[PDB]
Amino acid sequence: LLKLFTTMELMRWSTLVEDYGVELRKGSSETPATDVFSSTEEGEKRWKDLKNRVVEHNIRIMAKYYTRITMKRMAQLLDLSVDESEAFLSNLVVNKTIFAKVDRLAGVINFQRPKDPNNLLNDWSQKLNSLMSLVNKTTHLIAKEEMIHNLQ
Amino acid sequence: IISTHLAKLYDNLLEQNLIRVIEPFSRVQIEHISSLIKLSKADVERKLSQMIL
Numbered sequence: 001l002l003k004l005f006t007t008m009e010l011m012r013w014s015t016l017v018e019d020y021g022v023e024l025r026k027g028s029s030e031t032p033a034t035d036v037f038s039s040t041e042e043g044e045k046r047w048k049d050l051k052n053r054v055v056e057h058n059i060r061i062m063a064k065y066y067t068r069i070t071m072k073r074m075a076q077l078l079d080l081s082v083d084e085s086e087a088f089l090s091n092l093v094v095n096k097t098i099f100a101k102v103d104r105l106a107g108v109i110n111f112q113r114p115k116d117p118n119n120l121l122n123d124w125s126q127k128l129n130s131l132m133s134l135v136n137k138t139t140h141l142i143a144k145e146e147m148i149h150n151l152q
Numbered sequence: 153i154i155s156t157h158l159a160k161l162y163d164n165l166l167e168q169n170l171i172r173v174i175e176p177f178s179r180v181q182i183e184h185i186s187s188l189i190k191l192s193k194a195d196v197e198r199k200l201s202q203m204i205l
Contacts, residue, residue: 090180090188094172102176104184114177 008061013054013079055080055088056097063098063111071106082106166199 027037038047075085089102101110173185186196
């Protein structure tokens with residue numbers, strides 16, 4: 001239960017409903033102070049609410065990794081229908097937790113900031129500033145390193 | 153006095169409600185936004201048309 005939730009690696013809703021269902025849903029215990037998981041009366045609703053949560057986690061993880069994803073491809077991933085996925089994205093975008101651009105025609109989802117050619121050049125400028133710092137440092141390690149031939 | 157007041161109230165409501173549906177950008181279909189916004193098909197087209205200008 002902990003492990004799937006903790007990884008930002010892909011999960012699929014369905015696998016989870018069965019996996020958790022056997023082990024976790026049971027929620028046996030002796031204390032009267034907790035027996036809540038899905039065994040209790042509000043517990044039933046809590047499992048219903050879990051569909052929404054899992055699918056939303058899939059959206060966050062995909063937002064970072066992917067920059068552009070095909071629409072078709074994202075619905076499989078989330079475990080949602082074509083209409084549902086496009087719809088679920090707008091609600092999230094207005095609410096502000098991920099930023100997607102939704103084509104209601106099933107075309108593409110862009111988790112990027114709006115592309116400019118200009119944008120890309122700037123990202124390289126920063127990398128360049130780092131790249132120079134690394135090259136100056138490295139030269140030094142070379143001089144000590146050349147001296148030795150007794151440690152090979 | 154009443155009419156004017158009601159009118160100002162109408163232009164503001166219309167703008168607030170639109171921002172939520174539109175927000176993904178790109179090519180949202182007039183029809184999907186229409187459903188979410190809580191508007192009719194004929195009304196949404198006209199409201200959007202005024203708004204571009």
